[PDB]
Symmetry: D3
Subunit: 178 residues, 6 copies
């Protein structure tokens, strides 16, 4: 079953969502789910020797301003394999514009890693880690000649509100589309 159309957004939306991981932490290959088929696809190789600082993917049954599912970043100690489902607790949101599109990204922790039990909001994350994530998104497209802008971070409530918006964007798109 298609993990973008056929998985729900989460088991307890918006406090607990499913993250479908595309890119394990540590990868330079920018994988994306193929919308037509369900398979993992190489979108491109990053043009700089940078690596994704988080397990990176989508919330199923969401849509967003960049014409793709809403993006989620899960902090995993051991990275997962692509196309793994993680039950994830949103704790904040990175406010990014990407090539002119709103392209904000939920920051979340795995519900079922007790290391993160006390991580509940954006203030629980080491400041240098938030900075490292923002800096990656600030610079990783510089050699492609594409502009990104990072505004800062929102808290868990702002993240949850954005998840609800993205869920409605999917309904609107694929009530008529798929």
């Amino acid at each position: 079953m298609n993990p973008f159309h056929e998985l729900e957004p989460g088991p307890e939306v918006p406090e607990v969502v499913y993250a479908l991981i595309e890119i394990p932490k540590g990868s330079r290959n920018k994988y994306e789910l193929d919308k037509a088929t369900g398979l993992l696809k190489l979108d491109r190789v990053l043009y700089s020797p940078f690596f994704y600082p988080v397990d990176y993917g989508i919330i199923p049954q969401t849509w967003y301003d960049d014409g793709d599912p809403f993006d989620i970043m899960v902090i995993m100690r051991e990275p997962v394999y692509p196309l793994t489902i993680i039950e994830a607790r949103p704790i904040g949101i990175m406010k990014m514009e990407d090539s002119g599109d709103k392209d904000w990204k939920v920051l979340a922790v795995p519900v079922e890693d007790p290391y993160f039990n006390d991580w509940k909001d954006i203030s629980d994350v080491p400041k240098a880690f938030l900075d490292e994530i923002a800096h990656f998104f600030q610079r990783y497209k510089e050699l492609q000649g594409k502009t990104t802008k990072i505004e800062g971070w929102g808290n868990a409530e702002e993240a949850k509100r954005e998840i609800l918006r993205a869920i409605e964007m999917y309904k609107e798109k694929f009530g008529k589309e798929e």
Copy 2:
């Protein structure tokens, strides 16, 4: 096609079965196949810095007392990726109770690694390796507060008999269920 409902238990049951691997040797992440969809899911992160000592997964079209497919452990030199099918020869069985449920696990070797050609029964395995596997299952849930009990090991015949039982448990469950 669903690798739990749509793969057969094996090509020459019970002497050769299919193992659908969920967890590569060396992982601390406890992946499981999602029964509803077919996708890999993070069930939890082990609560201790322990790693699966075997490639760990299921026999398709089986069921078992813990309310999930029957568990199989494949000794792979190079671990496989999750959701890989391995043709596996049962050589023994670990007798485990897990949280009060019978939860025995086949020990098997890959048919198509010649390293293991002479591994045919539980006496062919290094004793310290059997001990390491049992000890993992004895201790890996201690910080979750869940009880496990390891009784010892059975031989290849006992493993094969248990495979036949698990195959019938699936028929009984999913002749009415799925």
Copy 3:
């Protein structure tokens, strides 16, 4: 969707094809797509301590003389995961006979790694790298007692012509078959 029947051979055949990777560079496990189901399967473990020198897989909706999809070798800096789709530019072809069957293999580079932007034909590849690939295929089955013969390399035009042949072999097989 089945990535062998349900993916097209490519977006701009034969100059740009899809490669569906089975084996990441660096693996000793010989994975293959299961034709019946779509899942990754362990075909065998190489009998020697050799590793695939390329990301290795198939072109979807192709067939070939060895009774399987046409083989493609993609030069990836960071290997991909099995069952990843790569948009690939053919640059040459390895002329191999395998156990008596024609079993030539496209050599390609990822379109979306700028490292390879100037790799367009077989003369762009380091000679020692072509030699390493040929030598692997020359020797990797010696302990299985199976014969392989490597004739040399063809250029990108010869590769493209062979892709068109393999695409027609699939139509012929699965217009009546699947």
Copy 4:
């Protein structure tokens, strides 16, 4: 120069010490510095499929009740190679008895990873992480038949006091010894 006799305990003892790492996080091999020569030696392979949860090593020019240098555990995101020096800030201490010997171990963070800038005492560490470390030391020798006892954790002051003791134990031993 010998990194046990010829490195000082630290640049600002006891608030900043040198950790000479023997074992990278994730290893099952229990490496130790060879006291006679300075080289890394395999002391043993852990008897269970457990891995060191921390970068593990010694403080130079220390001695301790188990007849070896005082042990230190450094929390590194990317593990270091054996025999690497890390400038480390003690934040707490694990109170362990090992085979009847006092064998407490400093817990420290790297001074020069900004991720850890706000980690200054034992209360800054996720509780589940302290539990995972203690559990490892509680169980990792069970198959060797050797007893360990973990009493709990002390704070950074208690750790610093123990570092000063271990430094004096070295002076006493190797004022007459080496």
Copy 5:
């Protein structure tokens, strides 16, 4: 023996030098040789999720404007371990200022990897690879608040001339110093 004072700069200076690697390609940890002792030391963890794109280290018995040995970058397919000696052929030089100091870095290939046999000058390197290296050095200190400037690349002759300068800087420093 100290691999900075006791190794020569090379076997056929300046056409073939020794590179003493500190940092394997793919590392985020910035290791440096400890000048006082000879041991590997963690200088810092990069503040961004970037990795060294090359095997990175020093030419022995050199000195440079940043108060440390002259830097060399070796293109290794399989990264080496820290403190490994590589016989390296200079092919070009990255013109970098680092925090106000001249801090140029030789780009070299291993003499004894035949993959690189035809890499002899800066024009032999893929343009995107030179860009990736420069971009790393342009951005990797942005979160430390330290300025770097990359001027571009020089050819193999310019690299060789700079090696000869750095060799004389060591003689001048350590004819009086060490």
Copy 6:
């Protein structure tokens, strides 16, 4: 201290020797100890996509017909780092001629991995594993144009006798040499 001149051949020669590992299992880089300095050096990159099937190194204070220390192969489950000392039990010997020189290699197991407790002679090793090792040494230099010949395997007694010969070759060489 130099781990070739300053380590003894073993603690209980010839039944237990020291192996000083140069090459971890899985490496394509052929590292060797530098005789002049003690440091690890890249001797060459293998010309084929083959990997060392064993942890590979030397017995200290030995010499041999190829003008270097006597070679030893240690079967490690988790490979060690270069320049690690392993206490090793010889179980057999590979009879190799390399470029015209006798170049036999001890096969050994780690004393302190209980997995190998019952491995005491060449008959204890899986036949396919001996074949894989021999095949590697048969083929790995084919692209260098250098001849190797593998005669077969000797048992543990023959290995032990060869260790005693190699120890005397060192005395003869470095009673006058070093």
